Symmetry: C3
Subunit: 548 residues, 3 copies
């Protein structure tokens, strides 16, 4: 066994052009993972109360009370973009392909090493590292997706985005049915409102165990492990954005009058009256045909409540939103059309040579235009009779419920069987790749965290743990804690993710928005004198596509 | 009107009637319940 | 034309170009000047057929 190598390293990005403009991309990420000995070799069930932030009668979105069960098992997640591509590869995909098809995924673990630490209390004292060539690693695969699903991208507990940089798996944990009640309360609401943690519904008690529910493999140095190839089932991902609203749909009016010279103030006037114009409207009252009035085939995107913090049996939780943009540049509602927010550190972006412990982030703002400016709407009478009068129109400015800050915009939900929509684009690096799908008879149209949802089948979770190394004293008839030999193990992980895409042709005359290196970018993509690396976020869908 | 729109059978004591077999078209019914909200979804925090 | 024995005419072709704007509502009473402008065009959404 122990001489000899088990695998090879490959972090190469291969592009193989086929026929009829189809490429077959295969990203390989062979990272070297390090892992320490689990503190407890026992399963825990911990409750989290933070009933000291949820008392301030102002703080309700700060409810950090949940219930988790800790597993001695350390997980490994690679469901990220930053872990596959590098800023130089992404440019290729994004500037030249028009659609992406996620294909294969196969993981491989090799060159397992397990070393014991001997603490020679002598002066310093000093530490002596050795190899326990008979030691083991406990690799497991939930190939039959039996356990919950914990995408470790959400909380930037992924894998390093820099290959030449050794990374660390995430200690596994999952949810346990916790029951609670919590009523809102502003700074003024008198008395003590209501908030408690009864416990658990005996019905919804699922206590998982990896040892019990999955085949475990012990690998020694001489061993190796390989998942085989898993094929996904997923609709393709588009690398284009829609810039069309409801005012950029169909046959525009015919301009009876056109400018006769230049000037950004020479407007071509139609030359007809609003209450004598031909066409179709979705009104039976008026005779006014406007760009706002005219009947459009449908409605792009929707309009939903903002900051509609709902709640159920587990506690309050915000209402998701599938939005694009919806306003002039730096003229948006960051929360109305739901703009993601990403917080990582050192190992998933951010300047490697940083200090302190404060995450960095970005509020990714797509290019698609389905979003809204809830600050330019209104609900008026069926009488129309404009110029509309106060008592005949409910505007954004006009409070609802007597309180100021509130709107009808805030409480508004315009989602009709006529709502047109576009899924959430990739957010690279950081962002997630693929995400399991809800087991509900009825399922969400699209997920907010990932472009690819695998329905019928997804690749299983890779749980990586260290095997208990025992001393000459051990009484299973003693609580204590199986005092064990301070063991840790270092192993190399490799990945092959396969994507198949198509190439973009030009159809316009005006060049399309591409990705480049400015005098402002340069040093965002290169190490520095000390070796300070970092990966910035960059818009994915940057290329027009006609909606209709 | 039933008389107008459907074939009627007269059965006397000696008679009998039988519908034949009808096959339905329906998605299966699950005998399980979901206890997960929005607070019981994903990777919980890491308790330091 | 909906009458066959009646000679008709095609329609001069035209299509939309990305125009960016802002306009806030305002009743007959809403005081001051509300807000409404045409910045122009988002260089991203420029399709010239």
């Amino acid at each position: 066994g122990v001489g000899i190598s088990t695998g090879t390293f490959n972090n190469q990005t291969e592009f193989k052009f086929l026929e009829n403009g189809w490429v077959e991309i295969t990203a390989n990420s062979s990272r070297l993972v390090h892992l320490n000995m689990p503190e407890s070799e026992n399963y825990k069930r911990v409750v989290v109360n933070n009933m000291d932030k949820t008392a301030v009668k102002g703080n309700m979105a700060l409810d950090d009370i949940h219930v988790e069960i800790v597993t001695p098992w350390s997980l490994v997640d690679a469901n990220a973009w930053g872990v596959w591509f590098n800023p130089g590869d992404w440019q290729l995909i994004v500037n030249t392909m028009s659609e992406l098809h996620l294909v294969s995924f196969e993981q491989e673990i090799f060159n397992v090493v397990l070393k014991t630490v001997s603490e020679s209390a002598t002066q310093p004292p000093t530490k002596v590292y050795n190899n326990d060539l008979t030691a083991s690693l406990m690799v497991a695969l939930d190939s039959n997706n039996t356990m919950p699903f914990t995408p470790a991208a959400m909380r930037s507990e992924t894998l390093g985005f820099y290959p030449w940089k050794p990374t660390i798996p995430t200690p596994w944990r999952y949810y346990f049915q916790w029951d609670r009640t919590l009523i809102p309360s502003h700074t003024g609401t008198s008395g003590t409102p209501t908030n408690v943690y009864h416990g658990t519904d005996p019905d919804d008690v699922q206590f998982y165990t990896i040892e019990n529910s999955v085949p475990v493999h012990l690998l020694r140095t001489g061993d190796e492990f390989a998942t085989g190839t898993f094929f996904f089932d997923c609709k393709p991902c588009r690398l284009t954005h829609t810039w069309q609203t409801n005012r950029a749909l169909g046959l525009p009016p015919f301009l009876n009058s056109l400018p006769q010279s230049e000037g950004a103030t020479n407007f071509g006037d139609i030359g007809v009256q609003q209450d004598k114009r031909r066409g179709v409207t979705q009104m039976g009252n008026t005779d006014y045909i406007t760009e706002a009035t005219i009947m459009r085939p449908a409605e792009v995107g929707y309009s939903a409540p903002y900051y509609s913090f709902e709640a159920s049996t587990q506690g309050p939780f915000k209402t998701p939103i599938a939005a694009g943009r919806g306003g002039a540049q730096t003229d948006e509602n960051q929360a109305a059309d739901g703009d993601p927010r990403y917080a990582f550190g050192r190992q998933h972006g951010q300047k490697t040579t940083t200090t302190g412990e404060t995450p960095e982030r970005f509020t990714y703002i797509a290019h698609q235009d389905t979003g809204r400016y809830p600050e330019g709407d209104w609900i008026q009478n069926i009488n129309f009779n404009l110029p509309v009068t106060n008592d005949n129109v409910l505007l954004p400015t006009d409070p609802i419920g007597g309180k100021t800050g509130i709107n009808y915009t805030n409480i508004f939900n315009t989602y009709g069987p006529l709502t047109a929509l576009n899924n959430v684009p990739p957010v690279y690096p950081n962002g997630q790749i693929w995400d399991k799908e809800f087991d509900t008879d009825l399922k969400p149209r699209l997920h907010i965290n990932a472009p690819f949802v695998c329905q019928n089948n997804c690749p299983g979770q890779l749980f990586v743990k260290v095997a208990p190394n025992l001393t000459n004293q051990y009484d299973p008839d003693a609580s204590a804690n199986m005092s064990r030999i301070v063991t840790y193990s270092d192993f190399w992980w490799k990945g092959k993710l396969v994507f198949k895409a198509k190439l973009r042709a030009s159809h316009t005359w005006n060049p399309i928005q591409q990705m480049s290196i400015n005098v402002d970018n340069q040093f965002n993509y290169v190490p520095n004198n000390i070796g300070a690396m970092k990966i910035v976020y960059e818009k994915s869908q940057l290329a027009p596509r006609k909606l209709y």
